[PDB]
């Protein structure tokens, strides 16, 4: 029945009580085969000319370190984020996935998307269960009306033109900023192209199929000409979900 009343009663978030043919999984196999080697580049993204990142990208995953992620433990402001020249490295048809937190980011992240030329097509929520800490209460942002138990990742399309829009995992430990890896599965399952950029990635997010750029990477291997060779003809327009070309 009333899981909101139940949360008031016991401290168990309503999302603790959500439960759970086909097969797919061949799509994952196709993705895995189609993936370019993992590439990565440590770069201070404030100080970095974004335009050295070529070629233009089919997908961009943008995960700027917001102050709100450091509740109990350089942060970027939405002022800083807005000034990124994201449109200078996006392909004319391309997609963006932006982690917006759960406060003013839900509005300012929309402003960013419009500033860079996308329209929002999906609102993906990461819902945090607290099954292992019903006791731990939440320190509220002054403006908050409710306890904030979720983060939003916004999807954006620019140009001309399966999974659910929810991710449910347990709330990470205090100070752990990692977003759920499932976002990568959602993104890859869209089959949007093979040029995938992850800005503000980390040593721990590097992944095949992706180019990771971020200030805390300890190693770099990115080379714009090596990277461009993975998409030269005849591979220019693979979705990322088809067989390689012999």
8 forms part of the interface with other proteins (CB under 8 A): yes
Binding mask 73-112 for other proteins (x = CB under 8 A): -----------------------------x---xx--x--
Q: Which stretch binds Mg ion (CB under 5 A): 70-78, 90-98, 183-191, 229-237?
A: 183-191
* 81: partner contacted, choices other proteins, Mg ion, none (Cβ within 5-8 A by kind): none
- Residue 78 dihedral angles phi and psi, to the nearest 5°: -65, -25
117 forms part of the interface with other proteins (CB under 8 A): no
Q: Could you give the strand order of the β-sheet that contains 196-199, starting from the edge strand earlier in sequence?
A: 39-42, 211-214, 196-199, 57-62, 90-101, 150-158, 119-129, 166-170
Site for other proteins in 178-217 (CB under 8 A): 186, 190
CB of 3: closest distance to other proteins in angstroms?
A: 5
Q: Which long-range contacts (CB under 8 A, 24 or more apart) does 174-178 make?
A: 174/71, 174/72, 174/73, 175/70, 175/72, 175/73, 177/65, 177/69, 177/70, 178/204, 178/205
Peptide bond into 138 cis (omega under 30): no
The DSSP 8-state label assigned to residue 153 in this structure reads E
Spatial CB neighbours of 101, under 8 Å, sequence gap ≥ 6: 66, 68, 69, 151, 152
* 185: partner contacted, choices other proteins, Mg ion, none (Cβ within 5-8 A by kind): Mg ion
- List 43, 155, 217, 241, residue binding other proteins (CB under 8 A): 155
- List 166, 185, 228, 236, residue binding Mg ion (CB under 5 A): 185
CB of 129: closest distance to other proteins in angstroms?
A: 10
67 forms part of the interface with other proteins (CB under 8 A): no
Contact 194, 56 (CB under 8 A): no
Query: How far is Cα 149 from Cα 101, in angstroms, rounded to an integer?
Result: 10
- Which residues contribute to the site for other proteins (CB under 8 A)? 2-5, 7-8, 13-15, 17-20, 102, 106-107, 110, 120-125, 127, 138, 140, 143-150, 152, 155, 162-166, 186, 190
- Which residues contribute to the site for Mg ion (CB under 5 A)? 28, 185
């Amino acid at each position: 029945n009333d899981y909101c009343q139940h949360f008031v009663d016991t401290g168990h978030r309503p999302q603790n009580f959500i439960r759970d043919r086909e097969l797919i999984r061949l799509k994952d196999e196709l993705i895995a085969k189609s993936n370019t080697p993992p590439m990565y580049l440590q770069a201070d993204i404030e100080a970095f000319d974004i335009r050295e990142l070529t070629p233009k990208f089919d997908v961009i995953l943008l995960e700027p370190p917001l102050e709100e992620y450091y509740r109990e433990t350089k942060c970027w402001t939405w002022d800083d984020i807005m000034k990124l020249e994201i449109d200078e490295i996006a392909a004319p048809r391309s997609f963006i996935f932006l982690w917006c937190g759960s406060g003013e980011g839900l509005d300012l992240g929309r402003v960013c998307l419009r500033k860079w030329g996308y329209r929002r097509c999906e609102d993906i929520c990461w819902i945090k269960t607290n099954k292992n800490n019903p006791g731990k209460t939440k320190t509220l942002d002054p403006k908050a009306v409710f306890q904030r138990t979720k983060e939003h990742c916004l999807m954006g399309i620019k140009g001309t033109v399966v999974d659910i829009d929810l991710i449910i995992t347990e709330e990470p430990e205090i100070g752990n900023i990692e977003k759920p890896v499932e976002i990568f599965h959602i993104i890859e399952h869209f089959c949007l192209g093979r040029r995938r950029l992850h800005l503000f990635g980390r040593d721990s997010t590097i992944r095949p199929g992706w180019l990771t750029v971020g200030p805390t990477l300890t190693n770099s291997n990115y080379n714009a000409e090596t990277y461009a060779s993975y998409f030269s003809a005849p591979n220019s327009y693979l979705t990322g979900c088809t067989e390689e070309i012999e």
